[PDB]
Amino acid sequence: QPKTFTVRIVTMDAEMEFNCEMKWKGKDLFDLVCRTLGLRETWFFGLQYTIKDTVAWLKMDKKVLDHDVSKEEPVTFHFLAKFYPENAEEELVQEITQHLFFLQVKKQILDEKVYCPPEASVLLASYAVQAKYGDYDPSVHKRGFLAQEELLPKRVINLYQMTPEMWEERITAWYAEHRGRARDEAEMEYLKIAQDLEMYGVNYFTIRNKKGTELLLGVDALGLHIYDPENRLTPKISFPWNEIRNISYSDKEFTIKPLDKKIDVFKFNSSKLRVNKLILQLCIGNHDLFMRRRKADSLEVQQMKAQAREEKARKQMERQRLA
Numbered sequence: 001q002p003k004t005f006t007v008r009i010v011t012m013d014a015e016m017e018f019n020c021e022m023k024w025k026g027k028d029l030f031d032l033v034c035r036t037l038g039l040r041e042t043w044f045f046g047l048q049y050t051i052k053d054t055v056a057w058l059k060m061d062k063k064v065l066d067h068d069v070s071k072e073e074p075v076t077f078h079f080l081a082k083f084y085p086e087n088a089e090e091e092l093v094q095e096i097t098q099h100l101f102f103l104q105v106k107k108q109i110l111d112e113k114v115y116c117p118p119e120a121s122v123l124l125a126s127y128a129v130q131a132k133y134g135d136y137d138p139s140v141h142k143r144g145f146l147a148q149e150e151l152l153p154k155r156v157i158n159l160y161q162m163t164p165e166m167w168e169e170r171i172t173a174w175y176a177e178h179r180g181r182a183r184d185e186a187e188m189e190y191l192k193i194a195q196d197l198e199m200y201g202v203n204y205f206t207i208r209n210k211k212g213t214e215l216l217l218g219v220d221a222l223g224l225h226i227y228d229p230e231n232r233l234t235p236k237i238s239f240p241w242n243e244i245r246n247i248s249y250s251d252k253e254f255t256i257k258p259l260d261k262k263i264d265v266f267k268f269n270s271s272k273l274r275v276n277k278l279i280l281q282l283c284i285g286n287h288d289l290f291m292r293r294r295k296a297d298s299l300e301v302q303q304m305k306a307q308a309r310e311e312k313a314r315k316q317m318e319r320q321r322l323a
Contacts, residue, residue: 007029242290
C-alpha cells in the first residue's frame with residue numbers, strides 16, 4: 001500500500017486538493033498538477049508557498065516535505081507563472097496557458113503591482129469584460145451593470161477629474177468596439193497591451209553597490225537591470241542576457257561579467273541567503289528561455305503551434321462550410 005498526505009493547489013481561478021506521496025519530489029507533484037490542468041507549456045510556471053518574509057519556489061530536486069514549507073494539512077502551493085515570455089502572442093500557444101497568464105497579470109495590474117497609465121488600464125479593462133461578459137448588448141447591458149466590479153486599478157479611478165460610473169462609459173465605449181471577439185482572443189489582446197508596460201514581468205530586488213548606495217535589481221525576460229529606487233519604470237543601465245558572459249557570486253556579492261572585456265564589469269551586494277537564491281534561480285531561467293527564443297522551436301513546441309494552426313483553420317472551415 002502507498003502512504004500519502006494531502007495538498008491544496010491554488011490557481012488564479014481554481015483550487016485543487018491532491019494526494020501527494022510522502023517521499024514525492026517537487027517535479028513529481030508539479031507534473032501531477034500540470035497534467036490535471038491540461039497545461040504542457042510547463043516551463044513558465046512553478047508552485048509557490050510562502051513563509052512570511054522571503055517567498056519560495058518548489059525545487060524540482062528536493063522532496064516537497066523537505067522544503068521549509070508550512071506542514072499543516074492541506075499543504076498549500078500557489079500555481080503561478082515564474083517566467084514571462086517576450087511576446088505572448090507568439091509564445092503562449094495553449095489557451096490554458098494564455099488564460100493563466102491573463103488572470104495573473106490582471107491581478108498584478110489591479111493590485112497596482114505593475115504600473116499602468118489611465119488610458120491603457122481603461123483599454124485593458126475593456127478587453128477584460130469582453131472575455132468575461134461576451135459581445136456588447138445595449139439592452140441586456142444597461143447602465144450601471146459595471147458598478148461595483150474592480151475594473152481599473154484604484155489609482156486611475158482616484159484620478160478625481162472623472163467620476164465612478166463615468167469610467168463605466170469610457171470602458172463601455174471600447175467594449176462596444178470589441179464585438180465579435182472570442183474570450184481567448186480578448187485575453188490575448190489584453191496581454192499584448194500588457195507586455196509593453198514598463199514594469200511587466202520584472203522581478204524587483206533590493207541591492208546596493210560596493211560604496212553603499214541603495215539601488216534596485218530587475219530580473220526579466222530581457223536581461224539584468226539596475227534601477228534608481230525612485231524610478232521603477234526606467235533602468236539606469238541594462239545588461240541583456242546575450243551581452244553577459246557570466247554572473248559570479250561569492251560571500252554576498254554578485255559580479256556581472258559582461259562579454260567584451262573591453263566594456264566593463266559591474267558588481268553589487270545584497271544579503272539574504274534566500275533572496276540571493278531566488279535571484280540566481282531566476283537568472284538561469286530567464287537566460288535559457290531568452291536563448292531558446294532566439295533558436296529553432298523544439299519538436300515539443302513546433303507540434304503545439306501546428307495543432308493550433310490545424311484546430312484554428314478547422315474551426316474556420318466548419319464555420320464557413322456550414323452556413
